[PDB]
């Protein structure tokens, strides 16, 4: 009734309606105060960032894109020198920047400019004030949130060495959510804990053989791999969505640090009851409703787990752009057994299955959403889930609220 550990997942390729990893820059740079994200790409890449950022584009944000010209299409030597020109320009125009990310696009990769080598070279040149890194955010390599994965993974080799046994909570979270996490862990007797990424470049966590880390976001595969290469050990936990997920997440950490069942129950009691009361308000319109999820962010499985177990929703097809079998084990073990799981996407075929299922609520991209509304399907746009505070106790009702709203608007208007 609740095991998806062994469910055979449909793997599909074909036409996709998903975002590339560049999109991740939009809400990543907000977290990392010292950082600047320079894409090397085409006008398309700049246009995407513009669309993805909305009004943030007018807020002098800490990203931009060196857009390729004819001259740059051949050949290497000259292009690299041209990149340095733009990077040197940028750095004096904004001197408070201490971290520069050279982000790879589809155009740059086909052109085979070695941004890894450019980062190396610029680091030597702008040392010690600016460290410069390189990772890929291209549509060739990466889907939406995976851009955060490649970014953090590119930082790990260079983090400070330490033998201390501190905790690292991995994944960019809204500051309000981060603080709550810190507070709960601190009052559990777990410390010190640091975040990756940190808010500033000078307070990035150290790693070493005694380090423990726990993921707050499901899309952190390469980052996990990188931290393990430095000797850090992962704490396995389902993802902190809703009352149950948050408790379970927190429980895995408390078990790892020897915290008693007595402490756990006492620190956690009030926030738990509070979370499950906020959720109850949404239990009316959600119980019994069928759920379909197009692939976007790799949040779909944890979210479907939360919606079924805590909100009484029935699952149908739950799709994800990438499924890390080990990282997703705890949540897969909690998903209802009927769930059809899909890794990847073949759009026309997946839209045929969707139509046949006729689900009550569909999570999908903005490009699908209105066209599906017009065909009489209640939708919920996915992208909101990656920027709105949704993890941990205090946000559990809001999260439920994100899925009940479109359903009560459909009822209200007809």
């Amino acid at each position: 009734t609740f095991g998806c550990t062994d469910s055979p997942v449909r793997r599909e390729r074909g036409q996709k309606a998903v975002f590339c990893g560049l999109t991740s820059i939009v809400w990543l740079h907000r977290k990392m105060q010292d950082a600047f994200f320079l894409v090397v790409g085409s006008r398309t890449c700049a246009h995407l960032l513009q669309a993805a950022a909305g009004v943030m584009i007018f807020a002098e944000p800490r990203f931009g894109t060196a857009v390729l010209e004819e001259q740059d299409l051949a050949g290497l030597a000259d292009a690299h020198k041209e990149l340095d020109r733009e990077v040197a320009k940028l750095l004096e125009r904004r001197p408070d920047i201490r971290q520069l990310f050279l982000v790879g696009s589809c155009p740059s990769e086909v052109l085979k400019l070695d941004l890894d080598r450019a980062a190396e070279r610029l680091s030597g040149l702008h040392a010690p004030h600016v460290r410069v890194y390189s990772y890929t955010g291209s549509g060739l390599d990466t889907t939406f949130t995976q851009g955060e994965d490649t970014c953090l993974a590119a930082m790990v080799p260079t983090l400070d060495t330490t033998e201390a046994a501190e905790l690292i909570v991995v994944g960019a979270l809204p500051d309000v959510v981060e603080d709550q996490c810190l507070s709960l862990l601190t009052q559990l007797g777990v410390g010190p804990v640091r975040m990756l990424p940190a808010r500033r470049s000078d307070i990035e966590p150290a790693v070493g053989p005694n380090t423990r880390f726990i993921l707050a976001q499901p899309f952190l595969g390469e980052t996990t791999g990188a931290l393990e290469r430095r000797g850090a050990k992962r704490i396995a936990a389902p993802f902190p969505f809703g009352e149950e997920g948050t408790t379970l997440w927190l429980k895995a950490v408390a078990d790892a640090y020897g915290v008693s069942a007595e402490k756990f129950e006492a620190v956690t009691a009030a926030p738990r009851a509070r979370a499950k009361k906020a959720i109850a308000a949404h239990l009316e319109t959600l119980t019994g409703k069928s759920l379909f999820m197009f692939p976007d962010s790799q949040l779909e499985i944890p979210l479907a787990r939360f919606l079924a177990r805590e909100c009484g929703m029935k699952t149908t097809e739950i799709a994800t752009p990438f499924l890390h079998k080990a990282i997703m084990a705890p949540d897969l073990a909690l998903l209802p057994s009927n769930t059809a799981l899909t890794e990847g996407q073949d759009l026309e075929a997946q839209l045929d299955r969707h139509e046949a299922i006729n689900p009550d609520l569909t999570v999908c991209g903005l490009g699908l959403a209105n066209p599906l509304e017009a065909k009489g399907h209640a939708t919920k746009w996915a992208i909101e889930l990656v920027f709105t505070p949704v993890h941990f106790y205090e946000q559990a009702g809001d999260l439920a609220g994100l899925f009940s709203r479109p359903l009560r608007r459909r009822a209200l208007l007809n």
Binding site: A46, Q50, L68, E70, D72, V110, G139, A374
Partner: protein
């Protein structure tokens, strides 16, 4: 490499999507990587469209490159024909695909489909969105239009209206009204609303109305050769330009100008005593060439502002604009760089700024009144209400829209001074 935050225009292939999405019964297939479907959000969210754009991508990625990229393009042309049975199709390269070796023409010639498939050359590292749109429409008209028997009644085509066009929807409606008032019916309106079959029947119209040069001129020039149809060179934005337009249409057709002005209120509005404080007010105008040129004449000769700066981001329009600015004793600012716009605005200290969504934001930062006259534009400037820029209702709309922020600015300033300067 140019360091870029804001871009006034997108890549040429979005221009192609503008033409495809305007139309019905045409599939546009683009060779591009997974991820470029983000542009679908522009047609679905902004224009609030109730269908997926008729646009699909070959969707290549890292694991399937090499000789697979040609296979993928082939599959997408085949799949799009089999599913939507279009009357005609277009195929083009994304910016990343332009770096690859695959030839869209030869791939689709080999597929040998039962409908025309039009290849598009779109230089994605040298040209932009508007050019993409102007080229795509030109190629589609080259492909489909033929010499034809003229219609018995005086008819015309509307040329240049697209998806994501600033007020295209209602401009089309208003132009149709002022032509109908002269007993001129429209033959086909393209791209917006047309099918490939509709495009075959372009030649039978007596003449062409070139509504937007940026996305229609190239097609108009072709139809002037092929079907001997001359095209209107005046864009009916503003009362005077509308009259100059109708006069022009008179010469082309031989029909007398008949207007209905029972609802034209802008002239009385600006002549009325309430508008007297509007005289001499310094305005900086920016946007695409068409809307900047039209807006400047309205400002100076219809509302009585002093035009203190003019420019456009649209390089294809550089000459007409430079010529027009000389008349106002101004040097035209031709730039795609919002930072240059910001400097010019600061150096001119206007009291009103007319422009793009970017100019809205520059203005707000400086606390200057501002109204939008040109794309690019956010969701609001794609309204549910009737909102043309053209003809007589356009003139009324333009008056309310430009004046409102000035009265807001004066009102705000007055009551901060009232308590208690």
């Amino acid at each position: 490499m140019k360091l870029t935050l804001w871009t006034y225009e997108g890549p040429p292939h979005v221009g192609a999507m503008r033409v495809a999405t305007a139309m019905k019964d045409l599939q546009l297939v683009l060779h591009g990587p997974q991820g470029d479907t983000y542009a679908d959000l522009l047609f679905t969210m902004i224009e609030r469209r109730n269908a997926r754009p008729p646009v699909s991508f070959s969707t290549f990625e890292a694991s399937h490159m090499g000789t697979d990229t040609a296979i993928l393009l082939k599959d997408a042309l085949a799949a799009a024909h089999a599913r939507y049975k279009p009357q005609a199709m277009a195929v083009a390269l994304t910016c990343t695909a332009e770096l690859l070796q695959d030839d869209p023409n030869g791939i689709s010639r080999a597929l040998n489909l039962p409908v025309p498939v039009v290849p598009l050359e779109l230089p994605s590292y040298s040209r932009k969105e508007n050019y993409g749109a102007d080229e795509t429409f030109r190629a589609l008209v080259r492909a489909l239009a033929v010499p034809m028997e003229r219609t018995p009644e005086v008819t015309c085509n509307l040329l240049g209206a697209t998806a994501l066009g600033f007020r295209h929807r209602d401009d089309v409606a208003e132009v149709t009204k002022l032509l109908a008032t002269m007993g001129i019916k429209v033959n086909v309106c393209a791209p917006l609303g047309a099918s490939p079959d509709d495009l075959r029947k372009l030649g039978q119209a007596h003449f062409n109305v070139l509504m937007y040069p940026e996305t229609g001129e190239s097609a108009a020039r072709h139809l002037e050769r092929a079907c001997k149809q001359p095209f209107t060179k005046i864009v009916p934005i503003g009362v005077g330009a509308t009259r100059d337009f109708l006069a022009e249409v008179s010469k082309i057709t031989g029909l007398p100008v008949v207007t209905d002005e029972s609802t034209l209120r802008q002239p009385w509005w600006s002549a009325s005593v309430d508008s007297t404080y509007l005289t001499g007010k310094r305005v900086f105008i920016f946007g695409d060439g068409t809307h900047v040129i039209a807006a400047a004449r309205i400002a100076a000769k219809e509302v009585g502002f002093e035009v203190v700066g003019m420019g456009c981001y649209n390089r294809e329009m550089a000459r007409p604009l430079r010529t027009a600015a000389a008349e106002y004793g101004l040097e035209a600012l031709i730039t795609d760089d919002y930072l240059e716009v910001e400097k010019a605005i600061e150096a001119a200290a206007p009291e009103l700024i007319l422009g793009t969504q970017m100019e809205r934001n520059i203005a707000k930062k400086l606390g200057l009144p501002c109204a939008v006259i040109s794309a690019p534009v956010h969701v609001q400037d794609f309204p549910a209400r009737y909102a043309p820029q053209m003809g007589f209702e356009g003139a009324n709309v333009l008056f309310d829209t430009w004046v409102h922020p000035l009265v807001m600015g004066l009102e705000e300033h007055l009551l901060t001074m009232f308590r208690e300067d």
